[PDB]
Amino acid sequence: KASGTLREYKVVGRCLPTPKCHTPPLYRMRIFAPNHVVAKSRFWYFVSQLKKMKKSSGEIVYCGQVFEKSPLRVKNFGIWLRYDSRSGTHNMYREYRDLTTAGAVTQCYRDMGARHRARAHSIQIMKVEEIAASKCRRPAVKQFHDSKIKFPLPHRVLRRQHKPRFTTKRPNTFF
Template sequence: MKRATGEILNVTELFEHKPTKVKNFGVFLRYNSRSGTHNIYKEYRDVTRVGAIAQMYDEMASRHSAREKSIHIIDIKEIPAKLCRRANTTQFHDSQIKFPLTHRIPRNGLYKSVFSAKRPHTFMC
């Protein structure tokens, strides 16, 4: 928030009751785009509300070119799985979830140097 649009009245750090449990968060927010003001609802999966909001700021900046100063968080709620609406959230609601990592880039050891005699193996089955 810009200094011209508001004033900080209170600062409270949010501590999570269960910071090791994966939860779904629904975020209601209002933001000013280049052409107008929009109310939107977004969902995130995270272990903390703070993490979910951080994800939200990143996503708003990337998808909507909205910076922090133009975003106004209306509400954030932890929501049960059955009330989740977004496919990107519900696709991970599966206790039998299973997917491979298709393209792996080794980041340590052999490939630390700029030049290497061996090509890296990026496909790990």
């Protein structure tokens, strides 16, 4: 699985009605995939691991994006995920602050890739919750819970280094 800006898909599936249980149970899951094609394929991967059913012995009954309920309020997300490193695999819990839950999972994929070098195919996210700041655990997020939060912007590095590329005056950083 590659990435992009991740999108949360709810996928509902079931086995074909065999003439033994004409109404098989319906199964719903939350898949985070770049598009509905990948989301459907990821659905069978988790379901076949979970319960004895294959894509051939089943079908998708619904696959639609889950728009963020409150994409205009900052919130803290707690992601429970497991992944396999070069050694054996591990269970892990991380916290992120973002407007959209898909944006949090994207952050988790990059943060996991940046720190533990875990490629996206190595990661399985099992749980994503909206976590209240009082219940947050990571100090990286706890430091952002303050009504009178205050910080300057110390080093403003020049980013227009080539417009112009030649100029008599050296830039200044403090503002």
